[PDB]
């Protein structure tokens with residue numbers, strides 16, 4: 675990424691946003707390498723409105739390598755470009771007179787895994803008696819709609835020759851009108867169950883062993899992501915130990931059972947996504963045609 679990305683231009687006319695129109699609020703997310711802060715921005719989309727945005731910036735004590743890392747990330751977001759189902763770039767603050775700030779879309783409801791897990795007592799397959807009374811309930815239509823949407827996002831990312839490498843519900847963000855968007859260690863005193871997840875549980879067999887990521891290894895990940903959705907945000911492979919024999923059994927053909935809320939065709943889609951042979955897994959385009967039909971047949 676480095677060196678290469680320094681040789682990509684930055685068009686300030688179309689991306690640069692003045693820092694004096696950005697008012698920062700509370701942090702949304704921390705990391706060992708940086709932070710996303712919630713902020714108010716005036717006129718970020720040219721209209722005369724104050725809009726809530728998310729700001730990636732460096733932590734206090736961040737190095738030169740971490741500045742390069744954020745600037746690469748900015749140029750990759752410029753490269754990737756706009757889609758409804760990715761966390762889109764809105765602007766950047768790069769000139770002298772303040773900190774480096776990369777401004778992206780705010781998704782107010784947070785990640786899809788925590789959201790879904792918080793709706794297990796507000797779920798019905800189809801809305802039976804008067805549909806007014808099941809207001810705010812999740813339904814099969816929602817879950818298949820979240821699915822289709824992520825498949826669109828990934829089809830788009832594939833067409834920009836991008837690879838996600840960590841496709842999971844934690845990295846899916848939910849904004850208003852049920853629109854979902856793809857994005858890419860806290861002190862143990864304040865850690866609760868569910869705070870974390872083991873990323874090996876989303877890795878294709880060829881990535882576990884051969885450590886190669888390709889768009890078809892993302893299709894396997896999409897499969898596990900489907901399972902998260904239709905279990906309403908459970909962790910994959912419940913109570914299973916992720917050791918050398920688990921990895922052995924994966925390659926042999928062992929697979930997760932159906933989660934509690936799946937349709938039979940949605941479980942069949944997980945299994946096709948989990949084909950041992952990468953080239954026999956469906957493409958994200960094929961997943962888009964297929965989930966769109968499932969979504970339409972749910973009627």
Ligand SMILES: c1ccc2c3c([nH]c2c1)-c1[nH]ncc1CCC3
Pocket residue numbers: 702703710728761778779780781782783784785847
């Ligand atoms: C509630 C809890 C966390 C978040 C996060 C976002 N929005 C939230 C709402 C967000 N929106 N856009 C980018 C990001 C990343 C930071 C994580």
